[PDB]
Design a protein around this nucleic acid. Structure first.
Lengths: 77, 224, 188, 50
RNA sequence: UUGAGCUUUGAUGUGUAGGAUAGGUGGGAGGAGCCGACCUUGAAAUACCACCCUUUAAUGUUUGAUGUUCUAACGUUGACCCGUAAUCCGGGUUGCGGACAGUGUCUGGUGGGUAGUUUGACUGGGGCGGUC
RNA sequence: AGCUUGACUGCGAGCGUGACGGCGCGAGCAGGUGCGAAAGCAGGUCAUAGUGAUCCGGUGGUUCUGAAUGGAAGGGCCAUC
């Protein structure tokens, strides 16, 4: 489904409030993007379904650091 | 030369305050004869929009007295009662022959709503690029013709329109009370903000500078 | 703020919708059996202004503003903008090139023309039935052969053009009409 | 419809004001009436405003 | 390549008519020089300079508008190799695209394709007309 | 026609009229003016039609409150749109 691999962002639901406060149940979809990362430790291509803020975690942390938390949750990569 | 020391004490980066540069206008100018003050104050008005015109008669709250020769167009007893207010040539269509000659002895035209058939039918083109005013917009034509020029011939300076942003007015004699003129410039703010034409743009007043005749440059502020 | 349903405005009552404000010229009324009544309101545009045709039902209303039409007096020209003058209150007014289109040639001075006043200041200017004008650019017309009707073109002092007969050549003031724009007579 | 309303601002130090109606398109000058003031307890001349 | 704005310095406004090589308006008696108001003028008469309209660049501009090129994101429902006895999918070179597209959030426009509802009362029936 | 702003602020015993919301008259008191020499009169126009309740929102004034305290915001009162 639409779940980020790093942060785990499943889509939340909310209201589409108009000018007259009319409620309509929409769904907030995350900004997902299938990106192929490079890992210095593995020396190969790693394709993860990260979100837009998931790459910002990889902006700070190492790419080898993020996949260590993927192993301790039963995630396939 | 005599046009270089003038450009020394003009600092456009330092917008001067009220009490600072207006009191020193006697030293910024090296004029020969007796001169006066001018006031240039802007109001944002587009050239192609007719609902932005700002006109009116400004009663000045003091300097000059009866100085401007103003004409009267009235009938009846008001043709002999407006003469006590200081006007010289008071009358009727005999004054329309002076309009046909193009006499620049008069500058302001004041009438009353019974001789409005004179200016509106004879002084059509020559009155207003003549720019002599006769408005109910302004107080040009009331029926109070006795008490018009007891203060309007003395101290009233008329607001005219321009195609741009500018509304230049006139300041008084240099040797007057300079503390009152800085409040006269402050009470031209309440007269120009008395009509907020309600379709004004971003600002009300952007640049307001009061020069004397041709030498001084005194950048004032719109807030203070 | 006024209200006018379709059983109210019938002739010469301005309506306002989105805009521009329109004018009713003539209308009929049908009240048919089984169904709601309506009215073939033949509206008239005011700004451009050609025509618009709507079939209003019993619903709904429309804002009626503004209506005001009155006699004015042209006296002034400067650059683009024009002005007028009253005779019942003596109030100034400003005109534009948008309000003068396909009419600015005929009105010259002190004409008894009418305008339509709506929210600052005009919409359009209607010239009077007869104005006096003068030709300045017209050839010294010979008789010619000529065996009939004609009739030479004349360039007018206002920038217009009319067809004049042979007896007027240079500096002859003439009165014409402003509905069609033809020669009728010469003032003497 | 025609006759709009005005606000008679007191020319004294108080913020008290009377209000009334004045037809602007007949007599366009201001009103300078002289009524009672319930704050200063004087007989101050009132001035026209909006 | 360029377009628009600014605190900047000045140049720049060639008719009718007045000797002409007049920027709009408010002032209007300033600079071995000599104009000027006054006046002949026209819809407006200048000097002296002001607040600015506009043509013109030098600049730190604020930055947008596109237009080529390059490849490493991304697309690849192009071939070829393998997982694989597999026109799914995945990996691999490579080819063509290329920072376009596509998707997500915010936002304007369109929107009976769809959904929730409203569509007054008196009345010698309801309607219609009329009234409140 | 002369002169002027009583078309003024705080009240108001009382009744009239309405289911009520409300409307209407009000002597006189207190402060403060106007006119008349003076007695007196004036809180609109000879009278009855010219107008709509609340909520919400805007302007001006008043420490009346103001989420610990000292302020302000926002509310309250009054004038009012």
């Amino acid at each position: 489904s639409r779940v980020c691999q790093v942060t785990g962002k499943r889509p939340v639901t909310g209201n589409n409030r108009s000018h007259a406060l009319n409620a309509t149940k929409r769904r907030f979809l995350p900004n997902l993007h299938s990106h192929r990362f490079w890992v210095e430790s593995e020396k190969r291509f790693v394709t993860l379904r990260v979100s837009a803020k998931g790459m910002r975690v990889i902006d700070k942390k190492g790419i080898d650091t993020v996949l260590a938390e993927l192993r301790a949750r039963g995630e396939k990569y | 030369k005599r046009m270089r020391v003038i450009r020394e004490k003009v600092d456009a980066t330092k917008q001067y305050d009220i009490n600072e540069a207006i009191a020193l206008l006697k030293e910024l100018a090296t004029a020969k004869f007796v001169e006066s003050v001018d006031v240039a104050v802007n109001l944002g008005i587009d050239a192609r929009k007719s609902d932005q015109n700002v006109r009116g008669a400004t009663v000045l709250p003091h300097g000059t007295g009866r100085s401007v020769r103003v004409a009267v167009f009235t009938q009846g007893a008001n043709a002999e009662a407006a003469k006590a207010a200081g006007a010289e040539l008071v009358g009727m269509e005999d004054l329309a022959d002076q309009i046909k000659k193009g006499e620049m002895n008069f500058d302001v035209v004041i009438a009353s709503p019974d001789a409005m058939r004179v200016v509106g039918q004879l002084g059509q083109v020559l009155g207003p690029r003549g720019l002599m005013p006769n408005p109910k917009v302004g107080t040009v034509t009331p029926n109070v013709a006795e008490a018009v020029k007891n203060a309007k011939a003395g101290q009233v300076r008329y607001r005219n329109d321009k195609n741009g942003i500018i509304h230049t007015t006139i300041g008084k004699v240099d040797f007057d009370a300079d503390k009152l003129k800085e409040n006269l410039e402050a009470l031209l703010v309440a007269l120009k903000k008395a009509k907020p034409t309600q379709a004004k743009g971003v600002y009300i007043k952007k640049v307001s500078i009061s020069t004397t005749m041709g030498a001084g440059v005194a950048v004032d502020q719109a807030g203070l | 703020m006024a209200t006018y349903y379709s059983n109210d405005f019938r002739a010469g009552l301005k309506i306002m919708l989105d805009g521009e404000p329109y004018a009713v010229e003539a209308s009929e009324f049908v009240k048919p059996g089984k169904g709601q009544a309506f009215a073939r309101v033949k509206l008239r545009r005011l700004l451009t202004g050609t025509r618009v045709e709507k079939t209003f039902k019993s619903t709904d209303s429309a804002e009626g503003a503004d209506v005001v039409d009155m006699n004015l007096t042209y006296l002034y020209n400067d650059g683009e903008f024009w002005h007028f003058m009253n005779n019942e209150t003596f109030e100034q007014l400003s005109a534009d090139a948008k309000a003068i289109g396909d009419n600015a040639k005929w009105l010259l001075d002190q004409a008894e023309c009418i305008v339509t006043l709506w929210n600052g200041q005009p919409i359009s200017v209607t010239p009077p039935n007869f104005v006096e004008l003068e030709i300045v650019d017209t050839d010294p017309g010979l008789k010619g052969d000529t065996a009939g009707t004609g009739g030479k073109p004349a360039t007018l002092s206002t920038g217009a053009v009319v067809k004049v007969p042979l007896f007027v050549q240079i500096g002859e003031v003439i009165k014409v009409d402003t509905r069609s724009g033809e020669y009728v007579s010469r003032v003497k | 419809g025609i006759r709009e309303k005005i606000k008679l601002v007191s020319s004294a130090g108080t913020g008290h004001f009377y209000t009334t109606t004045k037809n602007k398109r007949t007599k366009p000058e201001k009103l300078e009436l002289k009524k009672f003031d319930p704050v200063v307890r004087q007989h101050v001349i009132y001035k026209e405003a909006k």
